[PDB]
Paper text:
The complex was formed in the presence of the GTP analog 5’-guanylyl imidodiphosphate (GNP). McrBΔNC is dumbbell shaped with the two hexameric McrBΔN rings tilted with respect to each other and sandwiching an McrC dimer. Three-dimensional (3D) classification resulted in nine major classes with varying tilt angle, indicative of conformational plasticity. The two protomers of McrC in the McrBΔNC complex are related to each other by a two-fold symmetry. The catalytic residues, Asp244, Asp257, and Lys259, are located close to the dimeric interface and aligned along the FA interface of McrB. A particularly interesting feature of McrBΔNC is that the McrC stalk blocks the pore of the McrB ring.
McrBC is an antiphage defense system of Escherichia coli that specifically cleaves invading DNA that are methylated. Furthermore, upon binding of the endonuclease McrC, a higher oligomeric form—tetradecamers of 12 McrB and 2 McrC protomers—is formed. Here we present the structure of the AAA+ domain of McrB in complex with McrC at 3.6 Å resolution using cryo-electron microscopy (cryo-EM), which reveals the coupling between the endonuclease and the motor and the mechanism of activation of the GTPase.
Residue numbers in the entry:
A (entry chain M): 3 to 21, 28 to 267, 272 to 348
B (entry chain A), C (entry chain B), D (entry chain C): 168 to 457
E (entry chain D): 174 to 457
F (entry chain E): 173 to 457
Write the structure that this text describes.
Amino acid sequence: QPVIPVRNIYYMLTYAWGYANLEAIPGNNLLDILGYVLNKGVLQLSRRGLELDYNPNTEIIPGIKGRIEFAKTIRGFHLNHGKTVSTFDMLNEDTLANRIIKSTLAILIKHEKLNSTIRDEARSLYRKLPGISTLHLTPQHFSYLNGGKNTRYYKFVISVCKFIVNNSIPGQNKGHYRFYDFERNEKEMSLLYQKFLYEFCRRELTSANTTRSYLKWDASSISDQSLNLLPRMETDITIRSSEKILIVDAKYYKSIFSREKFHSQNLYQLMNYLWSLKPENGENIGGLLIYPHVDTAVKHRYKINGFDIGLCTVNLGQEWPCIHQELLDIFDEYLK
Amino acid sequence: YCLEDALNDLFIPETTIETILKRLTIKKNIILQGPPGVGKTFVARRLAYLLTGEKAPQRVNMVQFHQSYSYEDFIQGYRPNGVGFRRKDGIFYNFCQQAKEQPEKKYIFIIDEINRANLSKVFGEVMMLMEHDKRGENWSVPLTYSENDEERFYVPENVYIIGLMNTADRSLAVVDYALRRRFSFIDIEPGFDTPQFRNFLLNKKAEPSFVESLCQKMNELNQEISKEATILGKGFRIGHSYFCCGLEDGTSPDTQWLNEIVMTDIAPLLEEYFFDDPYKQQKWTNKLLG
Amino acid sequence: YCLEDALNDLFIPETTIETILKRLTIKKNIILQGPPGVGKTFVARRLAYLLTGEKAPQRVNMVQFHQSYSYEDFIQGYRPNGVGFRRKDGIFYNFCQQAKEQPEKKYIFIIDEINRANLSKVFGEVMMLMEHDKRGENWSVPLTYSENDEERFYVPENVYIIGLMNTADRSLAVVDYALRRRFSFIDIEPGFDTPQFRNFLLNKKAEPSFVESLCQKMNELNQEISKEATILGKGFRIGHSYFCCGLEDGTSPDTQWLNEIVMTDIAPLLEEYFFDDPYKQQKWTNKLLG
Amino acid sequence: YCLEDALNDLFIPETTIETILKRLTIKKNIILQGPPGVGKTFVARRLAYLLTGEKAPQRVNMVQFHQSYSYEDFIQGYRPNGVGFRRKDGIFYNFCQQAKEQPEKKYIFIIDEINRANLSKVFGEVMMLMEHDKRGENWSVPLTYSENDEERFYVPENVYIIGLMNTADRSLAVVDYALRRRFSFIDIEPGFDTPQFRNFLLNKKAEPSFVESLCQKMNELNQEISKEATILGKGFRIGHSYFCCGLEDGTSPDTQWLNEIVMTDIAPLLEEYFFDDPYKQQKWTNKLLG
Amino acid sequence: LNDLFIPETTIETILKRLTIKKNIILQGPPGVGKTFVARRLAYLLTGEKAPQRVNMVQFHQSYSYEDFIQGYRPNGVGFRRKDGIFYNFCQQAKEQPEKKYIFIIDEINRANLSKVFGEVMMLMEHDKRGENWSVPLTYSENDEERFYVPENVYIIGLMNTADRSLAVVDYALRRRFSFIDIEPGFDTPQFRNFLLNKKAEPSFVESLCQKMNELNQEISKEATILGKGFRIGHSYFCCGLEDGTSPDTQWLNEIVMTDIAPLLEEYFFDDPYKQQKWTNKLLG
Amino acid sequence: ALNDLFIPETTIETILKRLTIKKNIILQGPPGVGKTFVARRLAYLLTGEKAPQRVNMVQFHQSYSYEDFIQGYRPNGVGFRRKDGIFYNFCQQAKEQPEKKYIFIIDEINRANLSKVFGEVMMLMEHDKRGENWSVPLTYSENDEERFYVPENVYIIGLMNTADRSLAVVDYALRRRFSFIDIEPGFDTPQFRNFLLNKKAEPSFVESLCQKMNELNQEISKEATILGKGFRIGHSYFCCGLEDGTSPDTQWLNEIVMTDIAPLLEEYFFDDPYKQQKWTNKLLG
Ligand SMILES: Nc1nc2c(ncn2[C@@H]2O[C@H](COP(=O)(O)OP(=O)(O)NP(=O)(O)O)[C@@H](O)[C@H]2O)c(=O)[nH]1
Ligand SMILES: Nc1nc2c(ncn2[C@@H]2O[C@H](COP(=O)(O)OP(=O)(O)NP(=O)(O)O)[C@@H](O)[C@H]2O)c(=O)[nH]1
Ligand SMILES: Nc1nc2c(ncn2[C@@H]2O[C@H](COP(=O)(O)OP(=O)(O)NP(=O)(O)O)[C@@H](O)[C@H]2O)c(=O)[nH]1
Ligand SMILES: Nc1nc2c(ncn2[C@@H]2O[C@H](COP(=O)(O)OP(=O)(O)O)[C@@H](O)[C@H]2O)c(=O)[nH]1
Ligand SMILES: Nc1nc2c(ncn2[C@@H]2O[C@H](COP(=O)(O)OP(=O)(O)O)[C@@H](O)[C@H]2O)c(=O)[nH]1
Ligand SMILES: [Mg+2]
Ligand SMILES: [Mg+2]
Ligand SMILES: [Mg+2]
């Protein structure tokens, strides 16, 4: 049952979310890492100042505040008991974004398997935010916040809040929670990998242009021009440069972690992407298969059907900088 | 008031309008629930003349709800004079009184954008009377502002209530409790994949292949939106009324006419929808232009 | 008045201007969405004289929505008189009555920064009536604060409405999808690329190299701005208004003037725009000066 | 009034002041952004008399914004005279009427802590009007509470607006970028390492070594603060006012005097700026004293 | 200066700081005599025990600018503009310039201090006091009528350090206020001398300080969660012994279970064992 | 009354020890504890004279406001007049009688916002600041001629309940000014058993049932987070229905098991009916 050290995933999640010292914490497991980011992350915000959104308030008060609503006043006859219905803007920190932080912290404490200090420190924070009201979180709450009015820093911790709630399962007790075994499932780990690269390549490969490209089948059918039944095909990433184009397909498989047979079923998808894609520039066409391995990294090249294709691996579990060096080394070879 | 004049132009299947008329005679409190641009407001004006069987304005009344709408204006309330406060019979009160005179003749009250105001704030006491079973003088009640208990108001059985609600907003996930019990919801489809919508297009000098190509896209695009539930539900999907408009001149449908519609209405709407994924906007916009 | 007079100084292409009148005359309600500094307020007063065909202010009305506009302000509301309250006809209601005095000559109502206010609250009844189809006596409606004697308020056909919603503040964006179908949205570009922008500068003693250098750098920046959508979307890209004004005295444009602009206005804007790393700020700031 | 009267006691360089007066004559709206304690309030009354050139306080109005401030108070709104309410022309409206009487003489409005109040809500109609090229009767606008379209309010050309906004709080920032365009943003620094600040200290019988040591100390500290722009930008850095006042008695600035103020004021500040690091607090606190 | 349990140096620091700066915040945990110091201190600064000059108020989250300075509120006939206390209070000192008038604000941390003060958040500074810096208020009908802080007025702020709110941090207000910490002062003889002048046992007093300080040190151990601001105050011991009940361990045992245990629970929340330990440690 | 009360006599003695000195107190316990009946007898106990006039009781709710509590403007036949509230009228009545202790009971205090209701007076009720010296002009007191001050004689008891898990940590305002006491249900006490043997109850029926609920009360409180010590069932359901004229019996309990404890048990757990059925079955026999 071999897996990646948990700390390294957080780096990939960071690029996945598109935006610190982790050596200090002694808990290797993820929630210890993830909570310490948040627990420190909240405190980092408070230094600068948390978001305060003017919420208009229409209420019945004994006097003039802001703009009086003449209609609701006369209709309810509130003048007679010395009151008016007036609209004014109380400034609160009770916004959806901040409510989510507080509700997330409640979930974090309730998790049964967690560092005690992490749980101790967070309980302070829950008390330190009296005005904010607890909420029962759903993805629909996060859906409303896709507008992204908030600052760039807020979006990072909220992304963490999205990860925690979805990857939280009740355990021994009804109240308490237990963390999901994220590493074991390939699909979510794989979907992380594909998104990890797409945002990563934009950062480092300033030389090349990095875009996801939709592809269209060359087919025509007398039955339907739509071709809906045909598989929808959208590249994982395309990283185009003037001298050479390159398509990459990346996936996480358990079989490859064992140093035997090889799982390369994804390759079957790849040629059709090369085929359906036709470049106006006509500089070259290349493909790459990249997978995660634990122990070591090996690079091969192939000349299959007039295409220059590479199968390669990365030794996750080594260290983040050499991994960062290794990736830049990787794309340097093929992007030429 | 012949059905042929009313229902031919309409894009909706004759199946659904029949069911609409069934429950409306039965329960008399009905809600048409659909996204904007499917003719919810359009059908409702015609349906009133269908049921009455004649074109008469007096027997049918129309209003749109909004936050300022209140009990005091809708039903009964006091309006200031130069100084004094005079009670005023409201619309719904005034409308029923006309309906009271003629119980046999069907009377219709049309309420657009009903979710914007809470029904309790406007209707209030009348939600007891409004229900289909608790109608008639047997259930008569004296009003909040009635000078004496003797004066009473009962919803005559003849009136039928239609409410037009759009499933386009995040707030409506918490549908008002009053609507669900007292009104009977009906869902209105966008209705692109219909012969009459196409037959309308073909009649205005339109190529069938260009029309049928369009229908595949709209049916395809709405499927993508409807698949989502978190951000955009099935109720958010595009209506069929962007395409109806603009043909009074006689200008034939084409990619030129279509391109104006997509760029000026549907493209920025998609920017608001698919904010998180800009490329998804490009993915569909280029698809639609083709 | 004619198109040649208005379009002398405008930096926007003719293409959109025809697109506006094409969409306007069929649909009668439009929105121009763009970042600040692209002449949204500037074009709007010019357009009104085109449709009327004459330079008349009477047929035009101009307002701004300030997040405190109300149905009492726009349409119908109650105001204190000396001792007691009275009902006051709002501004739009006041405008339409003049507009229906003559259907022949077109009347325009212009709303700057319309996106701010909760438009469902302001319009209320009007949200349905604004549409091109639902105009005239056929769709007459009685208002909330209308007298018990039936008196109805309908949008005249001659009226055309224009709104000017900036696209920078994301929160203040139209999410009333029912309302967003009433209007047609016209994206407006920054206006750098056009020669009509360039000729204005060359006419005002500008070097073509310095001019061509200026547009080259801005277009690079707006692409970097346009690339992101997480925080800074396509809409945030910088307008041309900064460069337009202040040269009337005879101050010729040079790197001194441009450097004053960069340090004083844009560079504060950039650090607020990015607020993640100064190096990106230091990069683009030096680029403009170079 | 004269220029040299101000510059005697002013720590800011003249170059920024020249930049200030050049922009302000052009743009007519500005915002001064820096940490607290650098004389934003100090300069603002001084600068007004420079721009007018005459020491007239009648023509200057100075206000401090806050959360409970609105368009009703600022511009126009309905307020109680007594038994009967009246429309009360706000402070800014009254100020503009005074300036209209004397177009030649410049009239100045100074807003302290502008960033707090919801400026979009407060200015509203003014948000468009204030622009330097849109002032005058041509752009006169009817207000929310105006009886008719004919009653219209226009900013005079003479008016100059000055904004004071601290950068210590990132929660409260003028993120409304359209509003950001109207104001030309002028950064201000604490200006420790200046002759004029030191000459004031030396005038107060101060050691040149202690003075030059003092300036060197903070300059390093501010740069350390500016480094961690993610955590603390340059806007958070320490102002000079802690050191300025308190010597009115004639007390010479010995090291003991510095040791007293640091312990009482700056010491807890560093604890808050560095909540996580106790050692870092000890480092810089001890560094100044030793 | 006799029954006060806080050092003469701190008050000596305060009086010079207050006289110079004119605004201060006395921040410390509950039960350290923040109120008694300020009430005593104002009488020192005036030099006479005159209560009309001194007015005290206790802020709370719902307090507003409407209440403090100006506001529209109803008379019998109708609504009018009602001058809040501080406007009324500053007028009182404005009537008599010579004497020093004092204004005390308790539970200051709870409210949005910016919101209430508003206009005076600039004016309160010692240099900008006078007609020159006067400003028209929010609700002022005309610009001509203005409000200016007088020079004689001094403000003292009393703040609970055990309920930090990570909602709004204002470092500009911190410029206005000169912050002074207050320690509980168990070690001080003046607190002990009061009790030894109440027929306490010498060992009973000395062992008590050892007991409380060890608890105080533990609270200050973890700076992030808790600090010197949270640690226990002394004032619980002052009251309840002036009836005539001389000190004894039984008397302390009442206070520990009566008063301190919820505080311990609040601080050492979801950790009963620590409560049982530190509760029981004191009793022995 | 002392023997009639089911709670420890020491707790009864303990409360007056606190209240006399502190002058402000709050009782937090499960519903069905007789918190109202406790305070009333205790209020009479401190006076010693069993006078209802001295004692006044109020039940709070979120709408409850400063105008209802203290002072506010109410419409006349025409216009409006200042209308003195409960606490304002109450204290001035006690102001006449300084020696006489007067009591004020605030039920369901945690529901409403203390700040909104009390306002100014929230400091004046703290025992240190009492009497004429700490006079404050009221919000609606237009003149400065008259000020409102609470005299020392006043004692304030607050009845709060730990029933609901929805309640988060209590408002900070309360904690400072109030002394919190936890009240046990009181099954074990002889005083409750002596109230059943006086009604000719079987000692086995008495001993079993006390063992029966106490066994439940331990398990409901065994849960750390969701159902705490504050949740556990009180004795009030057992009192009402025995001295009316109907003697104790297992069927009398059986009705009571169905009446309150069975639905209440669903509310607390609300997850497993079998767990409820087990406990409901266990109660019956
Ligand atoms: N000819 C024709 N026009 C239709 C049909 N369906 C809708 N329309 C047109 O679509 C336009 C708007 O219809 P409408 O009822 O207002 O949609 P709505 O549901 O009321 N919109 P909203 O939900 O935003 O209030 C009108 O021109 C209407 O006549 C149809 O079946 N045939
Ligand atoms: N001469 C000239 N000036 C232009 C042109 N376009 C914009 N401007 C100028 O840019 C300035 C602002 O234009 P404006 O219409 O107010 O832009 P806006 O979108 O309404 N501003 P905002 O979004 O901030 O409300 C004015 O000086 C305007 O005349 C143009 O094409 N020619
Ligand atoms: N003597 C003298 N004092 C100065 C000078 N510059 C600033 N100060 C002093 O610094 C203090 C504050 O001035 P102020 O404008 O209010 O600073 P601020 O940045 O506006 N503070 P805040 O933002 O908190 O309101 C006053 O003591 C002021 O006199 C100066 O050049 N000379
Ligand atoms: N003699 C004397 N009494 C004190 C001292 N400190 C506090 N007290 C008394 O303790 C009681 C309560 O003080 P209080 O202000 O409520 O505590 P705080 O507000 O939290 O500081 C009053 O009688 C105070 O005077 C002190 O240092 N000396
Ligand atoms: N006679 C008597 N009745 C008690 C005693 N304790 C509680 N009760 C009774 O229980 C009832 C009040 O219970 P209570 O918990 O206050 O009701 P709640 O407020 O709705 O929770 C009344 O019948 C009280 O008299 C007691 O010790 N003696
Ligand atoms: Mg409609
Ligand atoms: Mg504009
Ligand atoms: Mg200042």
